[PDB]
Write a protein that binds this ligand. Structure first.
Ligand SMILES: OC[C@@H](O)[C@@H](O[C@H]1O[C@H](CO)[C@@H](O[C@H]2O[C@H](CO)[C@@H](O)[C@H](O)[C@H]2O)[C@H](O)[C@H]1O)[C@H](O)[C@@H](O)CO
Length: 370
């Protein structure tokens, strides 16, 4: 039934747990309360299991969308940050941790796709998607392509599809309307058609995936790619001179990438909810706290305004946030899963010629609203 008087924190092995332990150290140094950081295997699957029996960690870190299912089972305590603290974070990040009208976690980091370009091949990247075909023609004359990115996952193609109007679920007043889905509308239609046209016109290949695109950019064969902060470390080793900027606009409208927010939830069965609040609010979500973690392993962009403004000195992080604010938080409802699978199938089929754009989207829409 969770031990009282200390804090047990669970965070994934690919995050800065060592850096976080540094924050726990200061917490114990000031309060005399011990903080233990653990990163068990398959922790996202373990948490709902142990938390269901009134056990598990006091605090759990994970992408915000997975917290919707946890909150649905009443695994997370409703947090109580005052207005002063709420003003400390970007407002859109608070939307990522709200379930059934209640705040159930503290936003920590922000991640979204950005346009990654090769400064030596394209020092002045295109501001619009419409400009890409002509650029590809010019680059192809050199044996290079203009753009290569993962076309197998809807997460990567959606930014373009949503640009002129596509959307997963209408987020009206604090909640998502599962009856209002925007996959089979005019905007999504135009976006997908543009994508399909790039393929038909030989500017992109329907088979291009993550690994294919990554190697191409890393070897200087393509001038641009679309990826997240998680991929930077795999480019840095490549030595290629790259930059990260805002995604291209389509029909004059900004691309709208989905946003993932690393969040920290408090176990509903924790008898240390107040200690958790103190740690998260006044130790972790401060410039000194986030610096400790970030310095260990990059968080990318962060939810805390003050520190983000400091990190933004890195154009890659600034671009990450610019795209995120123009994007949409990933919905934390069960239906979002149906959205991913249906749209994944629609884009694949439309790109291969298996389905026309109209039928692909209509079919996706019809299944998502079921
Ligand atoms: O290939 C590396 C990625 O898995 C990367 O995660 C990022 O990209 C995926 C998309 O492939 C994002 O997943 C989201 O979107 C897909 C639909 O395309 C859904 O099936 C997922 O449920 C949804 O989360 C992911 O959010 C994004 O971080 C790496 O894992 C990276 O996170 C860590 O190296």
């Amino acid at each position: 039934a969770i031990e009282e008087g200390k804090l047990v924190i669970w965070i994934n092995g690919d995050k800065g747990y060592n850096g976080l332990a540094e924050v726990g150290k200061k917490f114990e140094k000031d309060t005399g309360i011990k903080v233990t950081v653990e990163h068990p295997d398959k922790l996202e699957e373990k948490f709902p299991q142990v938390a269901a029996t009134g056990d598990g960690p006091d605090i759990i870190f994970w992408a915000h969308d997975r917290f919707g299912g946890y909150a649905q089972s009443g695994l997370l305590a409703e947090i109580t940050p005052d207005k002063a603290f709420q003003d400390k974070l970007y407002p859109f990040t608070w939307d990522a941790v709200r379930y059934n009208g209640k705040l159930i976690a503290y936003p920590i980091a922000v991640e979204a796709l950005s346009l990654i370009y090769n400064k030596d091949l394209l020092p002045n990247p295109p501001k619009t998607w419409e400009e890409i075909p002509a650029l590809d023609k010019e680059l192809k004359a050199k044996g290079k392509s203009a753009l290569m990115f993962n076309l197998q996952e809807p997460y990567f193609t959606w930014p373009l599809i949503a640009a002129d109007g596509g959307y997963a679920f209408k987020y009206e007043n604090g909640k998502y309307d599962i009856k209002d889905v925007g996959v089979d509308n005019a905007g999504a239609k135009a976006g997908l058609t543009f994508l399909v046209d790039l393929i038909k016109n030989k500017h992109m290949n329907a088979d291009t995936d993550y690994s294919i695109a990554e190697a191409a950019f890393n070897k200087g064969e393509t001038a641009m790619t679309i990826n997240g902060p998680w991929a930077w470390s795999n480019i840095d080793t490549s030595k290629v001179n790259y930059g990260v900027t805002v995604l291209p606009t389509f029909k004059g409208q900004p691309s709208k990438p989905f946003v993932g927010v690393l969040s920290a939830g408090i176990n509903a069965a924790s008898p240390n909810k107040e200690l958790a609040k103190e740690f998260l609010e006044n130790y972790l979500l401060t410039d000194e706290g986030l610096e400790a973690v970030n310095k260990d392993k990059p968080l990318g962009a962060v939810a805390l305004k003050s520190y983000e403004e400091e990190l933004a000195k890195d154009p890659r992080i600034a671009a990450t946030m610019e795209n995120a604010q123009k994007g949409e938080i990933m919905p934390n409802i069960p239906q979002m899963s149906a959205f991913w699978y249906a749209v994944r199938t629609a884009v694949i089929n439309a790109a291969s010629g298996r389905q026309t754009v109209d039928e692909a989207l209509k079919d996706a829409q019809t299944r998502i609203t079921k």
